[PDB]
Design a protein around this ligand. Structure first.
Ligand SMILES: Nc1nc2c(ncn2[C@@H]2O[C@H](COP(=O)(O)OP(=O)(O)NP(=O)(O)O)[C@@H](O)[C@H]2O)c(=O)[nH]1
Length: 304
């Protein structure tokens, strides 16, 4: 319960079509059939679905339902260690806290996916874990109404490195790291432009920003997080590929899970990018941005 409730609520649209209604009592032939449709309807994809079936049908010689759960969780965990600790019984009440590998987190993704809002929630999250957090408003470009990262910073008391619209994004991020160092901050999130059809090639700007961060601190950024909208589609995964090829993702944040019945998309995402989902977005609330936990996610896909 508690956050678990918020997760189940966020996955309700995906869950209540067929997943929860699966008749785990009938003769396999029916159940597995219903299972394949439920998966495909949730956007798990044919590839991962036919593998799940194999894993269960061929193998899966334990409890039918549990076999499914274990297989789905296995598909969501890119890290062998955690997969192992899980199999060994590790299953704490609430998911462990996501610790950035370093001090700088470069945030990327296409315009509109919710990068700005996601960073603000991340600031809160980390602040509540006692980190001194700083923001860099690397997307000086587009504002057009909405709420700037700049306004979010004042509200959380998080300083925002920013410059006049048009300011060199790379020089901003450089100043941002310098500032984070001199003032002794624990974490810096660098927001970035997300428009793929301007006169300035997005991927190239991005690489110039990551390079600037490195010039300031040769170890950074230790995290490159792509934000993906669960409502987009497979084009968004293709874009993901380009972002990965351009800057090397270390993680993925999936937002707007509450707005779709295709939440099963997380499986294809992790299988394609082979990086972990760090946080999942279950709504437009402050604490709606939660640390990802495969076990919990899978449970919410099937239960409640
Ligand atoms: N329902 C839902 N909405 C979300 C989630 N995350 C972000 N959003 C919403 O998505 C919209 C775009 O957010 P924003 O942070 O402005 O996006 P951007 O990707 O930063 N766009 P811009 O380039 O215009 O600054 C907002 O209305 C925001 O609340 C989520 O997990 N669920």
């Amino acid at each position: 319960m508690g956050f678990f409730d918020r997760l189940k609520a966020g996955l309700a649209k995906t869950r209540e079509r067929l997943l929860k209604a699966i008749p785990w009592g009938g003769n396999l032939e029916e159940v597995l059939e219903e299972l394949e449709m439920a998966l495909l309807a949730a956007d798990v994809g044919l590839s991962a679905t036919e593998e799940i079936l194999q894993e269960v049908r061929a193998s899966g010689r334990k409890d039918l339902k549990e076999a499914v759960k274990e297989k789905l969780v296995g598909m969501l965990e890119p890290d062998e260690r955690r997969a192992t600790l899980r199999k060994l019984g590790f299953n704490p009440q609430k998911p462990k806290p996501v610790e950035p590998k370093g001090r700088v987190v470069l945030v990327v993704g296409v315009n509109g996916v919710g990068k700005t809002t996601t960073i603000a929630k991340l600031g809160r999250y980390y602040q509540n874990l006692g980190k001194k957090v700083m923001f860099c408003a690397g997307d000086t470009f587009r504002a057009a109404g909405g709420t700037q990262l700049s306004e979010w910073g004042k509200r959380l008391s998080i300083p925002v490195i920013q410059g006049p619209e048009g300011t060199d994004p790379a020089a901003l991020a450089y100043d941002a790291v310098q500032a984070m160092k001199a003032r002794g901050y624990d974490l810096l999130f660098v927001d970035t432009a997300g428009r793929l059809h301007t006169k300035h090639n997005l991927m190239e700007e991005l690489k110039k920003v990551k390079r600037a961060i490195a010039k300031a601190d040769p170890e950074e950024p230790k995290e490159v997080w792509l934000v993906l909208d669960a409502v987009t589609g497979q084009n968004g995964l293709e874009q993901a590929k380009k972002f990965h090829e351009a800057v090397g993702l270390t993680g993925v944040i999936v937002t707007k899970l509450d707005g779709t019945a295709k939440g099963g998309v997380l499986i294809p995402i992790v299988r394609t990018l082979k990086v972990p989902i760090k946080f999942v977005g279950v709504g437009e609330g402050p604490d709606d941005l939660q640390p990802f936990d495969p076990e919990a996610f899978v449970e919410a896909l099937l239960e409640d």
